[PDB]
Every structure is written in structure tokens, then in C-alpha cells.
Amino acid sequence: FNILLATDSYKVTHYKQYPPNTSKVYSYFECREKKYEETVFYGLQYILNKYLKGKVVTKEKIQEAKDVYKEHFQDDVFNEKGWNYILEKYDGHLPIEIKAVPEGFVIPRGNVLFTVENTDPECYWLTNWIETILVQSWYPITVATNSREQKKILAKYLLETSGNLDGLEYKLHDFGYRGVSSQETAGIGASAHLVNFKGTDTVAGLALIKKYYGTKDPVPGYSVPAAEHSTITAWGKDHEKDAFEHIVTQFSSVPVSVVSDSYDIYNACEKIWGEDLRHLIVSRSTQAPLIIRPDSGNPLDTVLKVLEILGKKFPVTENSKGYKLLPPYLRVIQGDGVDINTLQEIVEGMKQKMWSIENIAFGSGGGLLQKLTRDLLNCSFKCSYVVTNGLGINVFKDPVADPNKRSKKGRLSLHRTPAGNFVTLEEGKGDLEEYGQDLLHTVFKNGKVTKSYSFDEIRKNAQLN
Amino acid sequence: FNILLATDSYKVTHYKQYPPNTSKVYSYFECREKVKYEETVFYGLQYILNKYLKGKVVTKEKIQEAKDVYKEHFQDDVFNEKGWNYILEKYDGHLPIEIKAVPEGFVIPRGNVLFTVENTDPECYWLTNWIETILVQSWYPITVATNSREQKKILAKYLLETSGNLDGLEYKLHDFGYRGVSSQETAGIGASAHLVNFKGTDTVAGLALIKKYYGTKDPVPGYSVPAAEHSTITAWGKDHEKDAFEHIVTQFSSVPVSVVSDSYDIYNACEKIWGEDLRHLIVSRSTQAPLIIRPDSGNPLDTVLKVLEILGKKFPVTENSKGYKLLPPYLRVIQGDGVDINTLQEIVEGMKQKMWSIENIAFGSGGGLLQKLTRDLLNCSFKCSYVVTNGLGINVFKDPVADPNKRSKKGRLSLHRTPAGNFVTLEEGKGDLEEYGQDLLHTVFKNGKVTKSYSFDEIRKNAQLNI
Ligand SMILES: C[C@@H]1CC(=O)N(C2CCOCC2)N=C1c1ccc(NC(=O)N2Cc3ccncc3C2)cc1
Ligand SMILES: C[C@@H]1CC(=O)N(C2CCOCC2)N=C1c1ccc(NC(=O)N2Cc3ccncc3C2)cc1
Numbered sequence: 058f059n060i061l062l063a064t065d066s067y068k069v070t071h072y073k074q075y076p077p078n079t080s081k082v083y084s085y086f087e088c089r090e091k092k093y094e095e096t097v098f099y100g101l102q103y104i105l106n107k108y109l110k111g112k113v114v115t116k117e118k119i120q121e122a123k124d125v126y127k128e129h130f131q132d133d134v135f136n137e138k139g140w141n142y143i144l145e146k147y148d149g150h151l152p153i154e155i156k157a158v159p160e161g162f163v164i165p166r167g168n169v170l171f172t173v174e175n176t177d178p179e180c181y182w183l184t185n186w187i188e189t190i191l192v193q194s195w196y197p198i199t200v201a202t203n204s205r206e207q208k209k210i211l212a213k214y215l216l217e218t219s220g221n222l223d224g225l226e227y228k229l230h231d232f233g234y235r236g237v238s239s240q241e242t243a244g245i246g247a248s249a250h251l252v253n254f255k256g257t258d259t260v261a262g263l264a265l266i267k268k269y270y271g272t273k274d275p276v277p278g279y280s281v282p283a284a285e286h287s288t289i290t291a292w293g294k295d296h297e298k299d300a301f302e303h304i305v306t307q308f309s310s311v312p313v314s315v316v317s318d319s320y321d322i323y324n325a326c327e328k329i330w331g332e333d334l335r336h337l338i339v340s341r342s343t344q345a346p347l348i349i350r351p352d353s354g355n356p357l358d359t360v361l362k363v364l365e366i367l368g369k370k371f372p373v374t375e376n377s378k379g380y381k382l383l384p385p386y387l388r389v390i391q392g393d394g395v396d397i398n399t400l401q402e403i404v405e406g407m408k409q410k411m412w413s414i415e416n417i418a419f420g421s422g423g424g425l426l427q428k429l430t431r432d433l434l435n436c437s438f439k440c441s442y443v444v445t446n447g448l449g450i451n452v453f454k455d456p457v458a459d460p461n462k463r464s465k466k467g468r469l470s471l472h473r474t475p476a477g478n479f480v481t482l483e484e485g486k487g488d489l490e491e492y493g494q495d496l497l498h499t500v501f502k503n504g505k506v507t508k509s510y511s512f513d514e515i516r517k518n519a520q521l522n
Numbered sequence: 523f524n525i526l527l528a529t530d531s532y533k534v535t536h537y538k539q540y541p542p543n544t545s546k547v548y549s550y551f552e553c554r555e556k557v558k559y560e561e562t563v564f565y566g567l568q569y570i571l572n573k574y575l576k577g578k579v580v581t582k583e584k585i586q587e588a589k590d591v592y593k594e595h596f597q598d599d600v601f602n603e604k605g606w607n608y609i610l611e612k613y614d615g616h617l618p619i620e621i622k623a624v625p626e627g628f629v630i631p632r633g634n635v636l637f638t639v640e641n642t643d644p645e646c647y648w649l650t651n652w653i654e655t656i657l658v659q660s661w662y663p664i665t666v667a668t669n670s671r672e673q674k675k676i677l678a679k680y681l682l683e684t685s686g687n688l689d690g691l692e693y694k695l696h697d698f699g700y701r702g703v704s705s706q707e708t709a710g711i712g713a714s715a716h717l718v719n720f721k722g723t724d725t726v727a728g729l730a731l732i733k734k735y736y737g738t739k740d741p742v743p744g745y746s747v748p749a750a751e752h753s754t755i756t757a758w759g760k761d762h763e764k765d766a767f768e769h770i771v772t773q774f775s776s777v778p779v780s781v782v783s784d785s786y787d788i789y790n791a792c793e794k795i796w797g798e799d800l801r802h803l804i805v806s807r808s809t810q811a812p813l814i815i816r817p818d819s820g821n822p823l824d825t826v827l828k829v830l831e832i833l834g835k836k837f838p839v840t841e842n843s844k845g846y847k848l849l850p851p852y853l854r855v856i857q858g859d860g861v862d863i864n865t866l867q868e869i870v871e872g873m874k875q876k877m878w879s880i881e882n883i884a885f886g887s888g889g890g891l892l893q894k895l896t897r898d899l900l901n902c903s904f905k906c907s908y909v910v911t912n913g914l915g916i917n918v919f920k921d922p923v924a925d926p927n928k929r930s931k932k933g934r935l936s937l938h939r940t941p942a943g944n945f946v947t948l949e950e951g952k953g954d955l956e957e958y959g960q961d962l963l964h965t966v967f968k969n970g971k972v973t974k975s976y977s978f979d980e981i982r983k984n985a986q987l988n989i
Contacts, residue, residue, distance in 0.1 A: 058706070065700050066724040066746035067780070073773045074754035074766075082753065108706070125729060128741040132777060134748060185753045192701035234530050235658040235904075236897045240523070240574070241707035258531040263591060275594040280531035282600060286930075287547065287651045287906035288539035290918045300541075307538045311598055314532070321923040354924030423896040430889045431702045438701075440753035452756045457787040458820030464752075 060113045060151075061122035061140060064189045069126055072136045072182035080178035081444035082185060085469050087481075088198065089435035090167030091461060096434055097205050097519050098162045098170050099252055100197025100245065102509055103269045105155070105501050108190055112504075114140055114149030142179050150504025152177040153187065156497040158471060160510040161252065161518025163205075166434070169469040169481045169497065170198075173438075176503055181443075188438045195436035196242070199429045200249035204229065205519060207397050207421075208253045212521055214404035215414040218380040229400075229419050230280075231257040232392055233426030246426035251278045251512075252519045256418075258283075259426070270512035277512055282307075283314035283350070290319050298329050305337050305347060314348040314390055322351050326363055331370030339371070343385040348418070356394040357406045363389055364412050380413040392420025396428060439464040441483075451484055470495040525579045525617075526588035526606060529655045534592055537602045537648035545644035546910035549651060550935050552947075553664065554901035555633030556927055557863055562900055563671050563985050564628045564636050565718055566663025566711065568975060569735045571621070571967050574656055578970070580606055580615030608645050616970025618643040619650065621657075622963035624937055626976040627718065627984025629671075632900070634947045635935040635963065636664075639904075642969055647909075654904045661902035662708070665895045666715035670695065671985060673863050673887075674719045677880065678987055680870035684846040684879045688989065693745075694884050695866075697723040698858050699892030712892035717744045717978075718985045724749075725892070736978035743978055748773075749780030749816070756785050764795050771803050771813060780814040780856055788817045792829055797836030805837070807852035814854045814884070822860040823872045829855055830878050846879035858886025862894060905930040907949075917950055936961040 075082070088096045119140050126135040143149060157171035158164055173191065175184050211228045215221075231250045237243050240261060247262025248270075257263075257278040266277045284304055292300040297320060304315055317325040326349060330338060338347050349367070351359045367383060374382045383389075391403060400421075404414055440452050441464065451467035470487030472480050473496070480492065487495055500508045510518075540547070553562045585606050592601040609615060623637035624630060639650050639657065677694045681687070697716045703709045706727060713728025714736075723729075723744040732743045750770055758766040763785060770781055783791040792815060796804060804813050815833070817825045833849055840848045849855075857869060866887075870880050906918055907930065917933035936953030938961065940946050946958065953961055966974045976984075 062726050062730065063706065064726065065698075066726055067749035067751065070748035070774070071751065071754050073748075074750055074770050075757050076762075076766075076769075079757065082757070084753065125726070125742065129726070129729065129744070129746055130748075130777075131745065185751070189701045190706075193703070193705065195702070196704035232530070235655045236661075237659070237708075238662040238703065238893075238895075239659065239705055239707035239711055240528065240656075241705035242703075245705055260527050260529065260531055260591075260595070263595065264527065276591065278595070279597065280595055282535035282538075282596070283532035284539055285532065285536065285651070286920045287549065287918075288536050290920055290930075291544065291547065291906060291909045291911075292541050293916055293918065296541075300539075303541075304539050308535070311596075318922045318924075319920045323923070353922035353928050359924065423898055427704075427896050429704075430893050432889055440756060443757045445757070450759050452753075452759070454752045454756055454785045456784045456819035457789070458784075458825065462819050464756075 058108065059118045059121055060108065061118050062125060063108065064186050066129060068186050068189065069130070070134050071185060072139060073134070075181060076445045079181045079443055079445045080447070081174060081442070082181050082440055083172065083174040083442035083468065084184050084188065084438055084440045085172045085465065086170050086191065086194070086436070086438050087168060088166050088170065089437050089461065093202055093206065093434055095163050095165050096198055097201035097252060098158050098164060098198060099160050099201040099249055099515060100194045101157055101171060101500065102160055103197070103245065103265065104190060104194060105506050106269055109151060109187065109501060110504055110506050112149040113151060114144045116144065119144065136182065139179070139182060146177070147504065151183060152180045152503055153183060153501060154499060155501035157500045158497060159518060161515035163519060164479055167481070168479050169465070169471050172469060172497065185440065192431070192436065192438050195431040195434070197245050197249040198436060199433055200246045200426060201252045201519065202434060203397060203429060204250045204253045204425065207400055209521060210397070210401050210404060211414065214408055218378055218408055218413045219376060219415045220378050226255045227418065229254050229256070229421060230390070231259045231425055232420040232422035234259040234261065236423035237426045250425060252515055255279055266512050270510065270515065272512045281312040281314065284316050286316060286319055289316060294320060297325065298333050301329055301334055302337065305334070309345070310342065311345050312348060314350050316350045316352050318352045322353070322359065323362060323366060326366040327370065331366065335370065338386060339384070341386040346386050346388045348388045348390050350390045350392055352393045356391055356399050357403050360389065360391050360403055360417065361406060361410055364416060376413055376415070380411055382413045383416050388418065389416055390418045390420055395419045395421040396424030441465050441469060442467050471497050523574065524584045524587060525574065526584050527591060528574065529652050531595060533652055533655065534596070535600050536651060537605055538600070540647060541909070541911045543912045544647045544909055545913070546640060546908070547647045547650040547906055548638065548640040548908035548934065549654065549904055549906045550635050550638045550931060551657065551660070551902070551904045552635055553632050554903050554927065557672060559632070559668060559672065559900055561629050561631050562664055563667035563718060564624050564630060564664060565626050565667040565715055565981060566660045567623055567637060567966065568626055569663070569711065569731065570656060570660060571972050572735050575617060575653065575967060576970055576972050578615040579617060580610045582610065585610065602648065605645065605648060612643070613970065617649065618646045618969055619653065619967065620965060621967035623966045624962050625964065625984060627981035629985060631945055634945050635931070635937050638935060638963060651906065658897070658902065658904050661897040661900070663711050663715040664902060665899055666712045666892060667718045667985065668900060669863060669895060670716045670719040670891065673866055675987060676863070676867050676870060678989060680874060681880045682989070684844055684874055685842060685881045686844050692721045695720050696856070696858070696884065696886045697725045697891055698886040698888040700725040700727065702889035703892045716891060718981055721745055732978050736976065736981065738978045747778040747780065750782045752782060752785055755782060760786060763791065764799050767795055767800055768803065771800070775811070776808070777811050778814060780816050782816045782818050784818045788819070788825065789828060789832060792832040793836060797832065801836065804852060809851040812852050812854045814856050816856045816858060818859045822857055822865050823869050826855065826857050826869055826883065827872060827876055830882060842879055842881070846877055848879045849882050854884065855882055856884045856886055861885045861887040862890030907931050907935060908933050937963050
């Protein structure tokens, strides 16, 4: 990895475009305000450690970048001297100071989340060089936020239909490993989901958390044995029952998920699970349920019909809230077509049919880790303050046709209001001590990580009310 | 990187689930059949084969790590240590797998086999689908390359209709997506996939990926020019926008320069700053070094049309041989906000209805080009179609009652040209009848070795448009 090659091309040319005698460029990140009213701040620590800290500039990395940019631009516009300055003066450590809200913090839209500034006047150009790498923090923020919004929906309907939150942290399982754009993305996104839940198939998330954050537990997320279409269909179309019997017998004393829609989900539920193999299901322990997995058709209609079938083949109870509950050896997971909208539709449709949310879990792949963009929370990095000829000026954009893109002015700070909410003060007004101390902390300075959070602290910060 | 930790957790348990006495699992990848996206660019497998699958990928230390992690993750011992140990001792940790694939850059209709995977040692029946997770990530380069090519087709059609040729087509869609993707690795992969179709990119990560895994005869596969951002304009102060514009076009007076012009008022900047105060610095520029005015907010169509209306009243407009208006060659526009395949179509159609040549415009696309895409868009999918159990081959498949679109193919597969020059996927080993020409799938990986490679230049040639 070469930080000289990890920016937008046009930023290679920005050192020639700032006003003459600019000593300071100060920039900030927010989730701009215009429904996702509050964001989980997560993922900066990964970027600081993997890409920004320590000796990130070498002679060899400068020469590589020079040679690439000469061909890319068909011109010699690369700031070799500026990068050489960093190498010679700071042994290739970035003269940058980053301040940030603590990881796992849940902050309303339109607040400063981190600030960046150069600590050496020669390095005014470096603040926005690193915009591109720091702005990728959009992805872990957005995955963590959207996963937390789904947790709130599951909390609401579980509480209403059961009277408690038992099992909440296992109700949304990450299926997204194959559905993301890269190995690196898999680890980052899986880690962000694990801020809110404990259930994952995206193995890449475990090593990221252990290396960059840390937990008291041996692992931050868990799984159970489960079938796929290849392990049922390999038995032959006339042997689906044989495949089911073998799998639940092999995994007789742990939970096991069995995809049941290879040929006919309703037949598999009513006749195979509900008659032919029923004797192998009703004998299982509460710690080792069969989890029936549909994987096709309209997600709500399919869940409701699977539950109607099982309720007629298995002994159903009525819990203390008046909702129907399968026996504890039998559960359903809907792992197809699940995103925040269909999850809401399913739990609402289950509640209207008097089915406890105790009965159901969700798996989500592309919905959870891939079908998300930087536009969803308007994640954005902007210059708000410069010093030119020794005078500080408040800088901002304010496009005539889009007031939502107006950016904040001057030196920023994050404060508690007298009612306990968050406010971002602009124009250096934090320095009036009318709202108490800045809630941002220095997390990076001059090539060193100066403040960090365990994954356990982050989960506690990200908790639901 | 540890291939034993690079699968879906549940695949760790599949070796206990297949039928006993299974010697072979054969699986295939397609972009299942139902902007229709009728044809896909096959691109990106060679990256995965070289970075993750080839050579000694199993060691004692990787087996023990995986065992230790899975013990805690499952709260249970279920990991196939014996099976992984077998690969280490028998093959020096090289995967006993054969992958056959259509050549990279090939443009194939939906619902065709694009690659197959099978074990070459009967002990390793479980390994075929272990690597499903890593191989199915090929959805991303296929989908970026396909969606970028579908945008090239729209640009080609409107450029040809409004100008009578395709000059500059390979620079009309610029990759702005480095900050808008989910990781560094994704930036390189996605940027490389766009460069199959175009030559302009700011996503620098794409260049090193292509040089290391594919290679070009050119020194670099993609190019850029100087451009402003809001920080380099707004740093001058709100009353000095004109001073920022003047300094930037003067610094970059002999190359193309893109200047974001919407910091405060895009329409004032076009009419009064570029169109009056700094007009003398624009009309003096060479055809090889235009000013490129960049709006970046508002309704993308409305803003492009109004910018062109303003510039056409301040600068000498010609009418080309097709009857479309054309700015002078020292002045162009780039719309780089809110661009995806739908808004690109809307803008060029709106420009054509207002009699503006597509020669006047270029597009930048970030999240639309590299991020706002899922594995669902082309139904990219890997499925088992053939097993051997007690020495007898059986054709296998799924066919869910409530969704016929998820039916999978049966048996040993091959891809052929039809007598009319289309493509057909033969099932149930019927390729062996040789009623069609040669199978188009070639062995690209066997027993830990990459057996066939494509240059980036071959890939671009295979992915060309018809015209
Ligand atoms: C959601 C239920 C409920 C539940 O409480 N658990 C916990 C998980 C922690 O250990 C004790 C049981 N696991 C569950 C569960 C876990 C994994 C699976 N896996 C699953 O169906 N698949 C893995 C996977 C990955 C990618 N595509 C499809 C699938 C199918 C299914 C149910
Ligand atoms: C599309 C026009 C037309 C065109 O023919 N070119 C080619 C490119 C190859 O070299 C000669 C000129 N470049 C163009 C161009 C290149 C880069 C830019 N860059 C740009 O506006 N920005 C880079 C970038 C990245 C991330 N977010 C925003 C921006 C803004 C704009 C126009």
C-alpha cells in the first residue's frame, strides 16, 4: 500500500490551486442533514491504524508515485518536493491532527464527527489529500447505522409480541460475504454489523475486530451449522427427506439451519418435517432447535404460510402477550430478500397474524452489507477554515440550487446542550465556554494513534435506549 | 490472508452434509436470466485466481489458526482439519480444483455458464463449494464492467446521432468513485472494471491492479487531468471566487482543466465570471486544453440544460453537420453529480431534444458507477449441477415451486456458438455429442496453478461495442 497512490487523481494537482501563503487547511466530516436521524460513528480507528499511522512515506513510494503520475497525467504535476519534505523532516510520519467523536457514539445528523488539519505550514496540501481514504469511513458508519435501525424494529416487535428482548442480538444474521464487492469490504462491513448483533457467517469480520479493536471474549460473533442448496440437492430430487434426516442426525445436539425450498418449501414443511421426520424434531433440545429456512417467493407470504403449516403439525402455545409460539425445538429463519424495509413488513405481518417474533430470525446479505451508498446518510468531507498570510478565514460552500449541500463555517466543536442533546458550534464559538468542553478527542497526531476504543466500549456506546 | 477463514461459516460444516461416497462436486456460475442488462462482460476471475487461490494456500499454521477460531465461533469442534491436512501433505497445500471459464472480456447473454469448478481428487469433494464465497465476489467486476459498458452504449448511440461519429467516446464517462466505495480493495477492482470500457479515471487504485494482474502495452491503462474541488475554490473566500478561477486556469493553461463552478451560484459563475470577467482567459485556450466547467448540484438535467443555455449566449456556438449546437472547442461541460445509468440516459435525451450535441458534455460517476450495484442486478449465482456418488454421476439442481427464475441447470455444462452466432449452454453432458463447435470454457486454474491468462488489452478488445 502506498498513500501517495491512494487519493483521487485531481488531488495530486490541488497544491497548485490553494491561495498563495496558505499555512493551514482545516476540514471536517459530517452525515449532512436533509429515515436515519442518528448515525453510529464507527470505523475510523481501522483506517488510522491500517493506512495512516507510522512511516507511510519512503524514497521508493515517492519514486513509484512520480513514475505513475507522469504517465497518468501525461505531465509532471506530482508534488515530489512536498512528499520529500515529510520523509526528511518527520521520517515519513504525516504531520496531521485528527479529532473525533468516540467510536460507537450515536449522534444526530448534521454534527461534526471528525476534523483534520495539518500541523506543519508546509503541509497545508496534506489535509485534503487524505479526504478520499477518510471518506471511506462512510461504509462502516452506514452499515453500523442501518444494522442498528433494524435492531430497533426487531426490539419494538419482540417486546410487543413476547414481553422481553431475549435473543435480540441473534435475530439478524450476516449472510453477506459473497454479496459484497471485495474481501476487505467483507471484513469492514461484517465488523460494523457486529456493533449491534452477535450472529455472522462473514468470517472476515472476526480477525479485523481482534486486530484493530479487541474484545474480552475470544470471538465477537458466532454461528451454527446450516445447509445450502448443494448439500440437499446433491442427494437427488427423490432423496430430499434422506438429506434432511442425515443433516439433523449429524447435528443432533446443536442448532441446525436447513434450507427447505430446493423443490417445494410447503411440501417440505408439511410432509417431510411435519410428518416423515417429525419424530427427529420433537426429540431435540431447546439448545438445539431445527431452524427451517425458506429462501424463495414473496418473503412475507412465504413466512406466514410456513408458520401456518408448522402450527398445524407441531404443538403451538400462546405466550403471556396472547401471541402464538412454536415449540422451542423449532424456529424459522427468512434469509432471502431481507433489507430494512422487508424486515419491517415481515414482523408487522407476523404481528397482525398473532405470531410472536420469538418464532423468527432474519438473515441478510446484500441488503445488510452491499445495498448502501455514501448518499444514504450524506457522508461528506469539507474544508471549513484556512489560514492565508497569517489570517484565519471561515470557508464554506452554499450552492444556490441545493441548500442541503451548504457546509459549516470555521473551526468546529461538538457540545452537549443544556437539555443533553448534541450541538456543533461553528466559527470557533466553542472557545467561548458557553457550552462546556469539546466532545471531540485527538485520535491521531503526527503519525501516532493517540486515543483508541475496544470493540466492547463501542458496543456499549451503540446500545439501544 | 487465510483461505480456511475466507468462506461463509456454514460451509465449514458442509463436509458432514453431502451424501456418503461422493467423489465429485461440480458447480457453475451464471448471471441468471429473468435497462434489461441482456448481456454481461465476464471480467475479474483472473484477479481472484492469482491473489487468493494459486500456489501454497494451506500451511500447518493456517490450519491451527482456523481450528482455534472455529472452535470459539461455533462453540463446537466441527472443522474438517483432516481434509485440509490432506491437501497440505498430498499437494503441498495447492488446491486440487479445476476451473474452466469463458475468456475475460467476452460479452455473453444472460443465463449462460461463465465458469465451472470441480475437485480433481475424490477426497476433496467438499472443496468445490468451500470456494463459492470467494469466487462469487466476481459478481462485482462483472457487474461494474457490464453497467459501464451499458453506459458506453447509450453514449455511443447519442454521440453518433448528434455528431455523426464516436470521437472521444472512451473519455465520456470518468470514474469519480474512489471515496464512494466501501474499501481500498473494492476501489481497485471496480476502477479496473470501468477501464475495460473507458480510459478516464481518478480512482488511482485501478492502475496498479491492472499492471500487476492483467498488464497493458500502454504505460498506464487510464488517464486524468487537473481539476478543482470545493476546497481549492472556497479557500480563497466567498468574495474571491473569480480570483480562484483565474489562478487555477492560469496554472493549468496548456492542459485540459476541470473547474467546479457551483460553490455559491453556478449560473452567476457561468454567465458573469466565465462568461464576462474571465472570458479573455477561456477564448485564448487551445483545442487540446479546454476549460471544462463542472456543475455539481441541482437537478442534473435542468442544471446541464441551463448551463448550456448560458454558455451558448456568452460564447460562439456553431451548428454541426447533423444540425446540433456545439460550443467552441476550448469550452466543455462535465456533469459529475447524481450520475447513474438512468440519469445519464435522461441527460443525453434531454440534450438531444434541446438540439445540443453530446460532443459538448462528459460525465463523472462515483457511487453510481462503483457502489450502487448488487449481486442481484444480474442474478450472479453459483450452484452445484453434477455429483458422482458410488461412482455414478447424477444431474442435480434446485427448482423452487414459488420462483421458476431460481431453477438451476442440470449436469455437466458447456458453452457453444449457435449456427446463427449466438450462445447456448448445453446441459447433462450433451456438449460431448459435439453437435456444436468447441466448448468456449477453457481451463484457467488446475491443481494450484493459473493455466491461462489474458492481458488487459485482449480483455478490452473482447468487450468492444459492435459499431
Ligand atoms: C438465527 C438463528 C437463531 C439463533 O439464535 N442463532 C444462534 C447463533 C449463535 O449460536 C446459538 C444460536 N442462530 C441462528 C441461525 C444462525 C445461522 C444460520 N445460518 C444460515 O441459515 N445460513 C448461513 C448462510 C450464509 C450465507 N447464505 C446462506 C446461509 C444460510 C441460521 C440460523
Ligand atoms: C471528461 C473530460 C473530457 C476529456 O476528454 N478528458 C480527457 C481525459 C484524458 O486526458 C485528456 C482529456 N477528461 C475530462 C475530464 C477529466 C477529469 C475531470 N475531473 C473532474 O472533474 N474531477 C475529478 C474528481 C474526482 C472525484 N470527485 C470529483 C472530481 C472532479 C473532469 C473532466
